[PDB]
Structure formats: structure tokens, C-alpha cells
Design a protein around this ligand. Sequence first.
Ligand SMILES: Cc1cc2nc3c(=O)[nH]c(=O)nc-3n(C[C@H](O)[C@H](O)[C@H](O)COP(=O)(O)O)c2cc1C
Ligand SMILES: [Cl-]
Length: 381
Amino acid sequence: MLKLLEPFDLNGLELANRMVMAPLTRNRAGPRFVPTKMNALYYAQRSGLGLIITEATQISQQGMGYPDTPGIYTDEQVDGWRMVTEAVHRREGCIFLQLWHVGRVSHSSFQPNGQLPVAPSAIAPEGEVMTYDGIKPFETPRALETEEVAHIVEDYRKAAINAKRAGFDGIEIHSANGYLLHEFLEDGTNKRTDRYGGSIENRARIVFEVLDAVCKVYPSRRVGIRLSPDTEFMSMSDSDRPALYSYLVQELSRRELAYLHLIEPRIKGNVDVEKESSLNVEFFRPLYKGVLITAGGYQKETGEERLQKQHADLVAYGRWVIANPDLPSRFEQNAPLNPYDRATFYGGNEKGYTDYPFLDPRDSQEALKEAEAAERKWRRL
Ligand SMILES: Cc1cc2nc3c(=O)[nH]c(=O)nc-3n(C[C@H](O)[C@H](O)[C@H](O)COP(=O)(O)O)c2cc1C
Ligand SMILES: [Cl-]
């Protein structure tokens, strides 16, 4: 009788519970950034979460910044993702594809023709980046020309078309964690003087242009967006985050979107951080009138409290879902949680990916049966 386990109606999508698999980069794509049968097994295993949001999926090669992340820009990638959505849907799950452009968080080694990564302004993030040829320092990115923004928006439009073709119930716009859209939002990274820079309105313009474009493909009630209102991850900064995110969330409220997905400030991208901030989900609940997903650092007890107190409608879990494909059933049964192994988060094979155990072996068996059937059905000949 946990509220976490209550079925939830997401504008017609009957979910099984109020728990969400948070988007999680795993770096396990096959050649040419194509999802594989192993990826289908991983998501099928986790189909008991009310909603799955995929790993961030680049809309273009320019939008990639880490090895072996899947794309959504070729027909072969669509075909691989259809294997994934087939397996999830045969397990009665619901799945949204997270659309990604890494912006400056990349390296020219990943880019078409060895070009520099692109960004709102020519400001390198601090630190180093993993490439095919080992760790390298970040480069100063190329500032996008005003005219080029429309082309990136068109890439989002095309990615949504391919998501709809792949077989996704919806899409989530990644506008968090230091990537291209977040870089436009914040004045520490956006020094532009065109219509995409300066005012809070201008800084958020690209986000609304992306939503305009993808909403020509999916209805607005199947498009979500993810924000990190107060994070230092990947050298992000802004001089007035309360004003920026208050404006942004209020404007998104009017857009009739599937949901707004907010990351709590106590998470720095992929790790826990000691951080004082008022810009958590409680700050934004009164400012957004639709479905609100809260993510970051939650446990069973704290997730349940968010729902009981009506600070959010859905609770997303990342690291616990990596390790516990049947997390809802473990919460329901007060079962121990498998520990998550950070060493196998990124890259590698089945180990630390599809080999975390279920309470009920029949759950594992059914996930494997559906992944195998989906591969046989959708295999490229
Ligand atoms: C290995 C790993 C990969 C992640 N990949 C993504 C991603 O692709 N897109 C995204 O928006 N967030 C990503 N995140 C952030 C998570 O979605 C989530 O916000 C974070 O893990 C905190 O939630 P948790 O405490 O439930 O793990 C990732 C986090 C981890 C640890
Ligand atoms: Cl991320």
C-alpha cells in the first residue's frame, strides 16, 4: 500500500506504478551506435518500472560525447531501438526515449570530420574527456552561428520522427546536466548577444524552439523535459538560478507537456554531493500544474514521502534500478536491495548490466523470452 506502487494515469498511458527508471548512460551500443539484443534484455528486465526513460541518445554524431552511446539518427539505429521497444511492450512496459545533444561536453575525436564540439559560446568546460585514444583535455568548443540553431532544432525534429518510428511511447528532451540545451539556459556558459543570449527569455528560446519542433511529431502530452535547476556538474553556473528556472518552469506549465522531470540539487550528474539549495522539487511544485517527476538520491522512504506529501507525482530512481530490475517488487516486499556497482556503470558487457538478480526467477525468464523473441522478429536480414 505504498503510494510508490499505485498505478498512475499519464494522460492515457496507464503506468503500473509511480516509479520511473531514470535515464542512465551505459555505453553498451553495438557498432554504428545501434542498440542490440543485450540492450533489449536490459530494458525488458526493467519493464516493471511504471515508466522507463532511456539512456541519453544522441540526435546526431555532433551531439555525441562518450563512447558507444546509442543514436537515433539512422535507419539501422531505429531498427535496433524497435527491438528494445518491442521487448518492453511485450512485458507491458512504457518507454520514452531521451533525446541528447552533448554540446561542448565532447571531443573532436567523436565529431564528424574532426570538427570541434559546438556550444552557445566558445568556453571549454574544465577537466578531461574520455576518447577512443584515452583521456584528453577538453577543447574550446565552436560557438554556433545564429543560423545553425535552427539546424540543430531540425535534428531534434528528425530524432523525434525516428523515435516515433522506432516504437517509443514518448520522448524526453534532455535539458540538464551541462549539455547543449543547459549550456544555452545558463549565463555562465551562454555569453551570446543574438536572440539566443542575454535575457532569461532569450536564453530559454532554444528550448522552446526544440519543443515546438518535436511537438509537430508527437502530441505535447507525450513530450517530457528534464532540467537540473541547481548543479555544478560539467562547469555549469548561472547568476540567478531562481529567476531563470522560475521563468522556465512557468512557461513550460503552459505547454501541456507529458511531464516536467527535475533533478534534486543533491546530485552532481552521476554522484551524490553535499549541496545547499532551495531549488528542489518543493520549490517548483507550485509553479508547474502538470505531471512532475522528481529524481535524485531517493530511497524507498524518501520517495514515498514525496508522493504522500504531494510534492511530486512520480519518483525516478537511477542507481537502484541499475542494480534492482524489480525495484518496485522489492519495495513492496520490504526485500533487501542489490548493491549497485559503480565500476560497471559505463561500458562493458552483461556484467553489472543484465546479471543483477530478481526476487522471482520467472521475471528474469520472461524478460529473456521477450528479448529473444524481439530479436528474432526485428533482426536485420
Ligand atoms: C551511470 C549513470 C548514468 C546516467 N546517465 C544519465 C543520462 O543518460 N541522462 C540523464 O539525464 N541523467 C543520467 N544520469 C543521472 C540519473 O538519471 C539520475 O538523475 C542520478 O543517477 C541520480 O538518481 P539516483 O540517486 O536515483 O541514482 C546518470 C546517472 C548515472 C549514475
Ligand atoms: Cl546526464
